[PDB]
């Protein structure tokens, strides 16, 4: 999916505010909960994933396991709140050699490990809310010799508050950001 | 299966190995013919019909100590290809053993190391016997251990190096060959156990009550230390403590891997009957500074990690009760960041005694391999020894003409200061 429906510039894959937020995302919980909570500092409804175990509860953008996703953009931007807890996200890409490489960042490790199939990453965050700019092309060029083509899976399995995760072609700061993508509104 | 490969380099390497391989033959009953009249599989490999060969190579540039074994009483035990000889010696020259002469013979050395490693199923480690104060023992051993680290990874190297004493030594150029070997024995050897010459002369003079002993009596109780640290693989015991236990428990930081050695019961035949070989007695005697095989004062430094290798009828309680009294004594000081300091291995075989040997047949024995910060005091003795000789650059043109540049002395001395500054870094309390 998402190959023909290509939009110039930004491509929003999941937005929390709306009539139905979990429109395309599959859900999975085990000793945890998914809960749409309006936070305190932003006073806006954001989705929240909580669980006592990181690997048990997750949400994946492709609902069926056989189906795949397609975005040619080399940037993935997620706006998440730092809960002072474990965070973990995972992005699978299809490289030049038609190979599936899974970059998996987490908060519970401090050293990066590059296995031939899966690369594991540390993540350090600031105090409050945050946006993370996962550079797909740069990260796959650092990890392996090949180059980015498309992203097949994106999956957060964590204890976090998500809103406005999307794909970008290049770095775009506040003054050139589109109307509804701010979450700050200066 | 537990299988070790021992390498003997230099004129001290064979002569220790001559006393070593005398003892392993009696332990498993192997005759000098090579025929026994499953525990032998570590230091011996079965060959054809009832013949056992040692898993060792005796390599030395000088042919004098090699063909003495070839004409000696063990002419049938060793494989003739294992005994590697050369034309001329290194002649107390580290540059000769590492650049000029040592290049041609190290290719033939690895041809039999590869052959020995392929025949045996599971390697457990390497046992190197050499003297860093000589030419072949240091220079050719520096090249050989450099091969074994770059080729045979993850297999531990046990270093038994005869080291010069400040009080007396038998060569003028002892500071040069020992300083130049320091780079090889730092990065390449995983576990290095030090030995000193006249520190073990005083063991024979005081404990064995012999006034004029020689190298033959010197190396026999070296073999007591070597056999006791490897005895856990050969024979069953309460605490089976293998070779890989030494590397994981006796070194906290990967370049300070230098440890001492001490054999507790060193008694003659006539002193054996009067004195009571209590476990609390031998453990107290082992930790005594007199019983160390290198001149160290453990009162000067602090213990870092201690391994105790018990043999004979040692119950697991008397090892605990004796070492609990060790910690309570004030004269034994441990380093502050290591509360758990002791490693205890209990075996179930009394030590064998060679016919004609000085040592008596004892029921119990202790061989302690211990890490201490007083080991850095040994290198401080060699430091001012080297710099005073290097100030006027005496005995240098022998090294310069044999391939080495004059600059190689500079980083070798400055590598030794990295070893000294490491020992008084780890000894500093926080």
């Amino acid at each position: 999916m998402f190959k023909n429906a290509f939009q110039s510039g930004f491509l929003s894959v999941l937005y929390s505010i709306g009539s139905k937020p979990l429109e395309i995302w599959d859900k999975q919980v085990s000793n945890g909960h998914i809960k749409r909570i309006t936070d305190a500092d932003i006073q806006s409804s954001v989705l929240e994933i909580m669980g006592q175990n990181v690997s048990t509860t997750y949400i994946t953008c492709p609902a069926d396991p056989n189906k795949t996703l397609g975005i040619k953009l080399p940037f993935l931007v997620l706006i998440i709140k730092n809960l002072n807890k474990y965070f973990s996200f995972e992005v699978q890409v299809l490289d030049d050699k038609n190979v599936r490489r899974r970059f998996r960042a987490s908060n519970y490790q401090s050293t990066t490990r590059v296995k031939p199939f899966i690369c594991t990453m540390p993540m350090r965050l600031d105090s409050g809310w945050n946006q993370i700019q996962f550079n797909l092309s740069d990260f796959t060029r650092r990890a392996y010799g090949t180059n980015y083509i498309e992203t097949l899976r994106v999956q957060v399995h964590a204890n976090c508050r998500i809103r406005r995760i999307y794909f970008s072609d290049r770095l775009y700061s506040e003054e050139e950001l589109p109307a509804e993508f701010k979450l700050f509104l200066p | 299966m537990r299988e070790v490969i021992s390498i003997h380099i230099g004129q001290a390497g064979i002569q220790v190995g001559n006393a070593c391989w005398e003892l392993y033959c009696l332990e498993h009953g192997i005759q000098p013919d090579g025929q026994m009249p499953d525990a032998f599989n570590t230091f011996f490999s079965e060959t054809g019909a009832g013949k056992h060969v040692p898993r060792c190579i005796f390599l030395d540039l000088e042919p004098t100590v090699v063909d003495e074994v070839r004409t000696g009483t063990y002419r049938q035990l060793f494989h003739p290809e294992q005994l590697i000889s050369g034309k001329e010696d290194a002649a107390n020259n580290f540059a000769r053993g590492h650049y000029t002469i040592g290049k041609e013979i190290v290719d033939l050395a690895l041809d039999r190391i590869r052959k020995l490693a392929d025949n045996c199923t599971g390697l457990q480690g390497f046992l190197v016997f050499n003297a860093v104060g000589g030419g072949t023992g240091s220079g050719l051993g520096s090249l050989l251990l450099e091969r074994l680290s770059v080729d045979y990874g993850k297999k531990s190297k046990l270093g038994f190096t005869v080291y010069p004493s400040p009080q007396v030594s038998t060569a003028v150029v002892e500071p040069y060959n020992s300083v130049l070997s320091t780079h090889s024995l730092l990065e390449h050897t995983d576990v290095a156990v030090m030995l000193d010459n006249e520190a073990i002369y005083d063991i024979c003079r005081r404990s064995l009550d012999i006034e004029r002993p020689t190298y033959t009596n010197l190396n026999r109780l070296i073999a007591q230390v070597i056999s006791s640290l490897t005895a856990s693989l050969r024979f069953d015991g309460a605490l089976n403590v293998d070779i890989t236990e030494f590397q994981t428990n006796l070194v906290p930081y990967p370049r300070i891997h230098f440890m001492l050695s001490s054999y507790a019961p060193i008694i003659s035949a006539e002193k054996a009957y009067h004195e009571q070989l209590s476990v609390a007695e031998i453990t107290n005697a082992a930790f005594e500074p007199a019983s160390m095989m290198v001149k160290c004062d453990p009162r000067h430094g602090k213990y870092m990690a201690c391994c105790l290798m018990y043999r004979g009828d040692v119950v697991p309680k008397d090892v605990n009760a004796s070492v609990a009294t060790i910690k309570t004594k004030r004269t034994i000081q441990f380093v502050d960041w290591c509360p758990t300091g002791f490693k205890c291995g209990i075996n179930y075989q009394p030590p064998t005694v060679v016919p004609g040997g000085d040592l008596a047949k004892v029921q119990r024995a202790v061989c302690m391999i211990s890490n201490s910060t007083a080991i850095g005091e040994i290198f401080s003795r060699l430091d001012h020894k080297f710099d005073l000789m290097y100030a006027k650059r005496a005995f240098v043109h022998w090294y310069v003409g044999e391939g080495m540049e004059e600059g190689e002395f500079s980083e070798a001395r400055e590598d030794l200061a990295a070893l000294e500054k490491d020992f008084e870094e780890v000894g500093a309390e926080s």
């Binding site: - | 069953d236 009828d313 119950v315 179930y348």
Partner: protein, 47 residues
Amino acid sequence: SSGGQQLAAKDTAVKEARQARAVNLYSKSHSVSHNIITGEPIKFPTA
């Protein structure tokens, strides 16, 4: 054949050696000559 009888003899010798090693291990794995828990004498277990 005689090879089969020789194999049986080698197996019996193996059994004897294993019995000797088991006797050694039991004799130096039990300290006192009586059961620690119960009042029972200590015997080498044979069947």
